[PDB]
A = this chain, B = another copy of it.
Amino acid sequence: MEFGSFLVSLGTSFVIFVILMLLFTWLSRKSGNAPIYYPNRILKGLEPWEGTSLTRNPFAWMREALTSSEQDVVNLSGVDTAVHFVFLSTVLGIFACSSLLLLPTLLPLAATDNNIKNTKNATDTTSKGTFSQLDNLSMANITKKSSRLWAFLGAVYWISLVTYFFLWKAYKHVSSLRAQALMSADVKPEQFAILVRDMPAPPDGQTQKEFIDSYFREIYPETFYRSLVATENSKVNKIWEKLEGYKKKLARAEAILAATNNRPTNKTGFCGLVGKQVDSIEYYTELINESVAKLETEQKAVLAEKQQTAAVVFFTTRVAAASAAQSLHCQMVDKWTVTEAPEPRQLLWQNLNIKLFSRIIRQYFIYFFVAVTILFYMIPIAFVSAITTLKNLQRIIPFIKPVVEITAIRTVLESFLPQIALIVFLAMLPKLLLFLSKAEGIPSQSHAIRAASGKYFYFSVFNVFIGVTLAGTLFNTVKDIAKNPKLDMIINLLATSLPKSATFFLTYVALKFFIGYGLELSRIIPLIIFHLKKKYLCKTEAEVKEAWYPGDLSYATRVPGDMLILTITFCYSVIAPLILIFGITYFGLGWLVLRNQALKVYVPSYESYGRMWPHIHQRILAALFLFQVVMFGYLGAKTFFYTALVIPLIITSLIFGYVCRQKFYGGFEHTALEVACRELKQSPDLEEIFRAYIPH
């Protein structure tokens, strides 16, 4: 990317960000847009902003978000969003300290050296002004065999040290948060249950429930209570949601009749557009009653001769249900596979009744398909990186000469199109990845979400970083590789290649934090949909919650994006140490914006008690792995022996991973028998702990 395209993209993103901030500052203090700007404070009866009269100083949302403790977030949102905020805080601290040391000593060294302007004379491009004024401040203006590479090696060394320190402190802190939240938890149904799964069939005349009982009733006498057999109820769920659909439609028809004093009309055809006309109220009433009768018959008939191989088993104490979830129940780890029962809000009832070979086959095939689509998205990654360097792509396939003649078209294409394409592809990714993760037999929503995050991290790393960087290198160097000496191909490739991808990543990250956080704070897209789904034909009856329900923070899409930006900022923290500023800005603005949203907008849908965060630590340290490796390659592709001194860094990163896994990881999987025994329950009902898991 040239300097003109970079400046145009920055200007457009900043202008849009300012416009959206002005829209947010105006709309958010209007009483009309209270359901859409303070949904987490109006769904809880909490007086959206403070009680006094005309107030709400434009910059008041920054005073309540910057002065909110981490206990306020846990109390108001949950210990699962405070984990997101400690993730953001520790990434921001890593990049802040790294910038503080890196930038004042690595930017002058790159700027004052002259490898560029000495590689345009030796290679004699004549002219090919590909290098921009922004590429001088990168590890491509550094000459071969230079003492400044010592400062760059010290820089990667210090980034590794800072990352280790902050990861250790964060992982201690998250362990403390989880231990505090678990110890003070109330009586919840998921603390008394286990997920018995992969059970055999009764080889006699005996129902599955009678087999689950008299089996745990002999292992756990006087401490085992009941069991829900995971009955296959797909069609039951379908019929019940269809019944609920006609219940809501009849409520809408009644509201319309009350409003207009006239009987509404309905069409019996598809989607009520083309078909025979019938009265809404009578048809909906009779269809509702027939559906009620048919649903009752189906619910009665669910218990059938077919045998289901999954269950939820409830114990009378927290200790028994916590100890009898980490134990082995049969001397064949196939049968009676027992884990902690997820929340009733988190069970994937469809993913139960899947045996061990089935799960393993599904996992392997899904992983193979993920690799295949890794390649299939590596193709459009090549397209995007090709579009970024549009001027250098005039020499290849010179058919594009007529369009790339005038600066305006080339500038707008370079500054907008690749980012939009990358956003489109990486936005189609999350839904497919979450669907694939749920298809492995994973029995909880949190585990499925974090597995989708892991698959998206594989996508991010390989496709985004490696594909975009390598494609930038090739489209920037292949046509200039006419001679093939190994002494000249390496330096030409490296120097004239990598910081170009670095600059494109600056542009992409700036686009992300500016326009994304503008669209998130201003919230116009959910505000345009609202006030339009309300005043037009939709939203006839009250049904207040359904129209403006905020929803989850969507860690299946948020954390993958934050971690992609993390990976990028670890990419060019040393190669082009201007990504550090953009990463700091991204994560600081993310802190501010997401703090405002979590305090006031988003409401969580499940509580994993910070279980996600070890995955985050694993992936951050995986980025550190990858880019200690990248520094290993680069320092050495500059043809001087700084390669050796990074091997201890890679080895100590692996050792740090093992040590952190050994010292804190095991406390995240389970709840200890200290938060379970001495939590001093108050004689739990055990009856609404049961049937809090029942789907109906």
Footprint of B on A, CB under 8 Å? 175, 178-179, 182-183, 218-220, 319, 322-324, 326-334, 356, 360, 364, 655, 658-659, 662-667, 669-675, 677-678
Contact between A330 and B219 (Cβ–Cβ < 8 Å)?
no
- Shortest distance between the CB of A540 and any CB in chain B (Å): 51
Contact between A328 and B670 (Cβ–Cβ < 8 Å)?
yes
Answer whether A328 and B330 are a contact pair too, CB < 8 Å, given A218-B678, A364-B655.
no
Residues in B neighbouring A669, C-beta threshold 8 A = 328
Residues in B neighbouring A328, C-beta threshold 8 A = 326, 666-667, 669-673
Contact between B663 and A333 (Cβ–Cβ < 8 Å)?
yes
Q: Assembly of this chain: how many copies?
A: 2
Q: Which residue of B has the minimal Cβ distance to A175? A: B332
Contact between B678 and A331 (Cβ–Cβ < 8 Å)?
no
Contact between B331 and A675 (Cβ–Cβ < 8 Å)?
yes
Residues in B neighbouring A322, C-beta threshold 8 A = 327
Q: Could you list 12 A-B pairs, sorted by A, with CB under 8 Å?
A: A219-B319, A220-B319, A323-B324, A323-B327, A326-B327, A327-B673, A328-B669, A330-B672, A331-B674, A332-B667, A333-B667, A334-B663
Answer whether A674 and B333 are a contact pair too, CB < 8 Å, given A327-B326, A364-B655.
no
- Shortest distance between the CB of A316 and any CB in chain B (Å): 14
Contacts A179-B332, A219-B319, A323-B324 known; list 16 others, CB within 8 Å: A182-B331, A183-B331, A219-B674, A219-B677, A219-B678, A220-B319, A324-B673, A327-B670, A328-B671, A330-B672, A332-B667, A333-B664, A333-B666, A333-B667, A334-B663, A360-B658
- Shortest distance between the CB of A197 and any CB in chain B (Å): 14
Answer whether A329 and B666 are a contact pair too, CB < 8 Å, given A323-B324, A324-B323, A364-B655.
no
Contact between A672 and B326 (Cβ–Cβ < 8 Å)?
no
**For the complex, what is the distance from the CA of A179 to the CA of B659, rounded to whole Å?**
35
**For the complex, what is the distance from the CA of A671 to the CA of B331, rounded to whole Å?**
7
Residues in B neighbouring A218, C-beta threshold 8 A = 677-678
**For the complex, what is the distance from the CA of A326 to the CA of B669, rounded to whole Å?**
13
**For the complex, what is the distance from the CA of A102 to the CA of B658, rounded to whole Å?**
44
**For the complex, what is the distance from the CA of A670 to the CA of B330, rounded to whole Å?**
10
Q: Which of A334, A356, A666, A674 has the most CB of B within 10 A?
A: A674
Q: Is the interface of A mostly helix, strand, loop or mixed?
A: helix
- Shortest distance between the CB of A177 and any CB in chain B (Å): 11
- Shortest distance between the CB of A657 and any CB in chain B (Å): 12
Q: Which 6 A-B pairs have the closest CB atoms?
A: A333-B666, A331-B672, A179-B331, A323-B327, A219-B677, A328-B670
Contact between B331 and A667 (Cβ–Cβ < 8 Å)?
yes
- Shortest distance between the CB of A258 and any CB in chain B (Å): 56
**For the complex, what is the distance from the CA of A333 to the CA of B669, rounded to whole Å?**
11
Answer whether A360 and B662 are a contact pair too, CB < 8 Å, given A323-B324, A667-B331.
yes
- Shortest distance between the CB of A30 and any CB in chain B (Å): 47
**For the complex, what is the distance from the CA of A331 to the CA of B665, rounded to whole Å?**
10
Answer whether A178 and B331 are a contact pair too, CB < 8 Å, given A219-B319, A323-B323, A356-B662.
yes
Q: Which of A331, A666, A667, A671 has the most CB of B within 10 A?
A: A331
**For the complex, what is the distance from the CA of A327 to the CA of B326, rounded to whole Å?**
6
Residues in B neighbouring A356, C-beta threshold 8 A = 662-663
Residues in B neighbouring A670, C-beta threshold 8 A = 327-328
Q: Which residue of B has the minimal Cβ distance to A666? A: B333
Contact between A329 and B219 (Cβ–Cβ < 8 Å)?
no
- Shortest distance between the CB of A671 and any CB in chain B (Å): 7
Contact between A662 and B333 (Cβ–Cβ < 8 Å)?
yes
- Shortest distance between the CB of A470 and any CB in chain B (Å): 24
**For the complex, what is the distance from the CA of A489 to the CA of B360, rounded to whole Å?**
45
- Shortest distance between the CB of A661 and any CB in chain B (Å): 10
Q: Which residue of B has the minimal Cβ distance to A677? A: B219
**For the complex, what is the distance from the CA of A674 to the CA of B319, rounded to whole Å?**
20
Residues in B neighbouring A175, C-beta threshold 8 A = 331-332
Answer whether A665 and B219 are a contact pair too, CB < 8 Å, given A323-B324, A360-B659.
no
Contact between B327 and A674 (Cβ–Cβ < 8 Å)?
no
**For the complex, what is the distance from the CA of A663 to the CA of B331, rounded to whole Å?**
11
**For the complex, what is the distance from the CA of A670 to the CA of B327, rounded to whole Å?**
8
Among B219, B655, B671, which residue has its beta carbon within 8 angstroms of that of A673? Answer: B219
Answer whether A333 and B665 are a contact pair too, CB < 8 Å, given A326-B327, A327-B322, A670-B327.
yes
Q: Which residue of B has the minimal Cβ distance to A678? A: B218
- Shortest distance between the CB of A483 and any CB in chain B (Å): 24
Q: Which of A658, A673, A677 has the most CB of B within 10 A?
A: A673
- Shortest distance between the CB of A343 and any CB in chain B (Å): 19
Q: Which of A655, A658, A670, A672 has the most CB of B within 10 A?
A: A672
**For the complex, what is the distance from the CA of A329 to the CA of B675, rounded to whole Å?**
9
Residues in B neighbouring A675, C-beta threshold 8 A = 331
Residues in B neighbouring A182, C-beta threshold 8 A = 331
Residues in B neighbouring A333, C-beta threshold 8 A = 662-667
Residues in B neighbouring A327, C-beta threshold 8 A = 322-323, 326-327, 670, 673
Q: Which of A218, A327, A334, A655 has the most CB of B within 10 A?
A: A327
Residues in B neighbouring A665, C-beta threshold 8 A = 333
Q: Which residue of B has the minimal Cβ distance to A364? A: B655
Residues in B neighbouring A323, C-beta threshold 8 A = 323-324, 327
**For the complex, what is the distance from the CA of A356 to the CA of B660, rounded to whole Å?**
12
- Shortest distance between the CB of A113 and any CB in chain B (Å): 40
Residues in B neighbouring A673, C-beta threshold 8 A = 219, 324, 327-329
**For the complex, what is the distance from the CA of A307 to the CA of B436, rounded to whole Å?**
53
**For the complex, what is the distance from the CA of A322 to the CA of B327, rounded to whole Å?**
8
**For the complex, what is the distance from the CA of A330 to the CA of B671, rounded to whole Å?**
8
Residues in B neighbouring A324, C-beta threshold 8 A = 323, 673
Residues in B neighbouring A331, C-beta threshold 8 A = 175, 178-179, 182-183, 667, 671-672, 674-675
Residues in B neighbouring A178, C-beta threshold 8 A = 331
**For the complex, what is the distance from the CA of A203 to the CA of B569, rounded to whole Å?**
45
- Shortest distance between the CB of A605 and any CB in chain B (Å): 25
